[PDB]
Design a protein around this nucleic acid. Structure first.
Ligand code: ZN
Ligand code: ZN
Ligand code: ZN
Ligand code: ZN
Lengths: 137, 135
RNA sequence: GGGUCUAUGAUACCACCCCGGAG
RNA sequence: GGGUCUAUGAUACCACCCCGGAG
């Protein structure tokens, strides 16, 4: 019966030039999943500005559905609906707003609702950048 | 009598201050297989912070040591300064002839030097055909 | 993201530090 | 040294181009 589901997790891997990858879903409809499950992701489904991709291990929230080939992402964002980070293989020019992740402005000029602090490197809500285990690789 | 050789930097550990040279020429004779020659940062003819980049072209004097072969003085082709590792980038204008920061090519005290590959300092090719830059 | 690295000698695998309504 | 890379959908394995001139 349910066609549209909520999930959360991290990017498992993303091939930047092929424009696709997989998400490791660690929570489905707000329930922890152990073992995690793979959810397919296409670049067209990434909520972010400009060139779309994911960096390995970045924290994500998404809607998904069952497809003929498995589980397919509908819309992928960072925690709280913010923009995804993207791969370090395609660096971008501008600074990112610490509140929404947008390129336009800084957090003091942000018109968006207040967001919790997220790791500047992987967007995880559980740690800050100085203690990032992903950055420490 | 000190020995003369030529080759490339095999590898250089920037923070350990040492590496090895791959000697492909000894006393004007081609060596195949090449032989490793130890190199310490103190023996590099270059200004400021001393290191080598992997694959850069070298000319050197060396001697036999208890541990193997040891560099006495290492330079780029024709006695010019070594390049050094991209891990420690330097700032400032370089002389187009010798690579010094002190002056410009017109004021250079070294004889006129042939064109050397911008990437590895080889006298045998230019940067557009550099096999080292290829990867 | 930002900063400072002029000295680990023998086949290594690349130093240290700072930054969370902040630029 | 300089420039360009906004579209390869299902467990992949990461695109190129220009410059030998001179302070
Ligand atoms: Zn914002
Ligand atoms: Zn993190
Ligand atoms: Zn000169
Ligand atoms: Zn070359």
């Amino acid at each position: 019966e349910p066609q549209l589901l909520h999930g959360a997790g991290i990017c498992k891997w993303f091939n930047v030039r092929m424009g696709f990858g997989f998400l490791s879903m660690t929570a489905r409809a707000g329930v922890a999943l152990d073992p995690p499950v793979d959810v397919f992701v296409h670049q067209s489904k990434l909520h972010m500005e400009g060139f779309r991709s994911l960096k390995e291990g970045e924290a994500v929230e998404f809607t998904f559905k069952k497809s003929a080939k498995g589980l397919e992402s509908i819309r992928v964002t960072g925690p709280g609906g913010v923009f995804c980070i993207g791969s370090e293989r395609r660096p971008k020019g501008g600074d990112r707003c610490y509140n929404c992740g947008g390129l336009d402005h800084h957090a003091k000029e942000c018109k968006l609702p207040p967001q919790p602090k997220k790791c500047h490197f992987c967007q995880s809500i559980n740690h800050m950048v100085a203690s990032c285990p992903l950055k420490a690789q």
